[PDB]
Amino acid sequence: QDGEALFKSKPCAACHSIDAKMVGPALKEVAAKYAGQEGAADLLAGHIKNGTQGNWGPIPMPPNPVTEEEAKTLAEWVLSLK
């Protein structure tokens, strides 16, 4: 599956929109923040799979039910969002 397909088949939409702020940052805003940051795809892939907190606010993103390979597809897709 591609990034947009995984975005809908995994639980992401409970907390994220592509364009609007929900629980987590809008995915276009993640793309904007990490544009030009060397290494961002691997960083986001680990965060999508394993969870993270404190990059955008106090609310954490729990770990997600994704494989490495799904997390990498999703991270590359998120970074592509313009």
Rule CB under 6 A: which residues touch ligand HEC? 10-12, 14-16, 23-25, 30, 44, 47-48, 52-57, 59, 61-62, 64, 66, 74, 78
Closest to Zn ion by CB, 2 or 21: 2
Q: 3: which residues sit within 8 A by CB, 6+ positions away?
A: 73, 74, 76, 77, 78, 80
Contact positions with Zn ion (CB under 5 A) in 4-33: 4
Residue 67, burial from CB neighbour count under 10 angstroms (0-12, 13-18, 19+): exposed
Q: Give the CB-nearest residue to Zn ion.
A: 2
